[PDB]
CSV table of C-alpha atoms and ligand atoms in Angstrom, one decimal:
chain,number,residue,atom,x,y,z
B,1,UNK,CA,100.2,106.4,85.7
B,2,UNK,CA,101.9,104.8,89.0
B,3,UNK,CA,102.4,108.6,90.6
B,4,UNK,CA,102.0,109.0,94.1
B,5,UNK,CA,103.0,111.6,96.7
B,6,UNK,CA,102.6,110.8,100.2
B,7,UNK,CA,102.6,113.5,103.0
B,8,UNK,CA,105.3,112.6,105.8
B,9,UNK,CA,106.8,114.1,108.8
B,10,UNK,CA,110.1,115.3,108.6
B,11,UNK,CA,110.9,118.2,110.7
B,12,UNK,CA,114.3,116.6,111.0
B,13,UNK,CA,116.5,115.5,108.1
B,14,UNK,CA,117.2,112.4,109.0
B,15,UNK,CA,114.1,110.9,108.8
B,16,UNK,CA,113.8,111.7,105.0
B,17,UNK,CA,117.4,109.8,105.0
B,18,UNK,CA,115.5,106.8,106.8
B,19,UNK,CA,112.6,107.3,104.7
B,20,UNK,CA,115.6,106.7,101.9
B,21,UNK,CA,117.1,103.9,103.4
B,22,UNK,CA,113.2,102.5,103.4
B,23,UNK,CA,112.1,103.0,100.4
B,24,UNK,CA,115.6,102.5,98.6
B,25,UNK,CA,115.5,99.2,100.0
B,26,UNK,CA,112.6,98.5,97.6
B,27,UNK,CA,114.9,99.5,95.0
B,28,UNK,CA,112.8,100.4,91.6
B,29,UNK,CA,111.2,103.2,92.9
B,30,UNK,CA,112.3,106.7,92.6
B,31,UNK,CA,111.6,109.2,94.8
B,32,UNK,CA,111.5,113.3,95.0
B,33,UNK,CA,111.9,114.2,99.0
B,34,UNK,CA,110.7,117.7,100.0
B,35,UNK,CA,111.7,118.7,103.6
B,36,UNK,CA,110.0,121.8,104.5
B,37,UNK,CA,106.8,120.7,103.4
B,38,UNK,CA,107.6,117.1,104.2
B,39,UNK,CA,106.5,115.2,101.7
B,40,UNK,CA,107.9,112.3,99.2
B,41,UNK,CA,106.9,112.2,95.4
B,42,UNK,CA,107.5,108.7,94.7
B,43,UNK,CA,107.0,107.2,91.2
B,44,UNK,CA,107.3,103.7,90.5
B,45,UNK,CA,106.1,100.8,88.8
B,46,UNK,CA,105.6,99.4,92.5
B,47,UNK,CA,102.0,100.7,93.1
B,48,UNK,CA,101.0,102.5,95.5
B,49,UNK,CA,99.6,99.2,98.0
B,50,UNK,CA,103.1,98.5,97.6
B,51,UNK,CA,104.5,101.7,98.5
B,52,UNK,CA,102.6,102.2,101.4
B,53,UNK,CA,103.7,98.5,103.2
B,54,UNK,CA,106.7,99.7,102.8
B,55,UNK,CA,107.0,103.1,103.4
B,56,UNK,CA,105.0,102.8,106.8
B,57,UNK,CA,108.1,101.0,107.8
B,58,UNK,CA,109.7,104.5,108.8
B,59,UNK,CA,106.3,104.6,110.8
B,60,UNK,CA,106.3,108.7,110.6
B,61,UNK,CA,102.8,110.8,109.9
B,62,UNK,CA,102.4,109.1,106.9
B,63,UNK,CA,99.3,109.5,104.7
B,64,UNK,CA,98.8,108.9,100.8
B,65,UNK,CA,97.7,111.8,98.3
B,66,UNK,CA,95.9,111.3,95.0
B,67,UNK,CA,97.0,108.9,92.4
B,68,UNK,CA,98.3,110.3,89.1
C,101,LIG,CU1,113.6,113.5,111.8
């Protein structure tokens, strides 16, 4: 499927709100946000490439996990 968890740095809220306003901005995607462990579960019909452009927007610690 188009399931696709990235690994991010947020060891302040805020930037999973900016990773938000990012990704929002995109608009079909959905997107689970863990803090503690910092990461973002996004699933999406917008693949992955497409994900990635835009989420390295925020410009955090951002690296891509597995497909599912
Ligand atoms: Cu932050």
């Amino acid at each position: 499927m188009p399931k696709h968890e990235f690994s991010v740095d947020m060891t302040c809220g805020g930037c999973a709100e900016a990773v938000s306003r990012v990704l929002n901005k995109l608009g079909g995607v959905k997107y689970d946000i863990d803090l503690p462990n910092k990461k973002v579960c996004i699933e999406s019909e917008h693949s992955m490439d497409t994900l990635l452009a835009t989420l390295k927007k925020t410009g955090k610690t951002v690296s891509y996990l597995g497909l599912e």
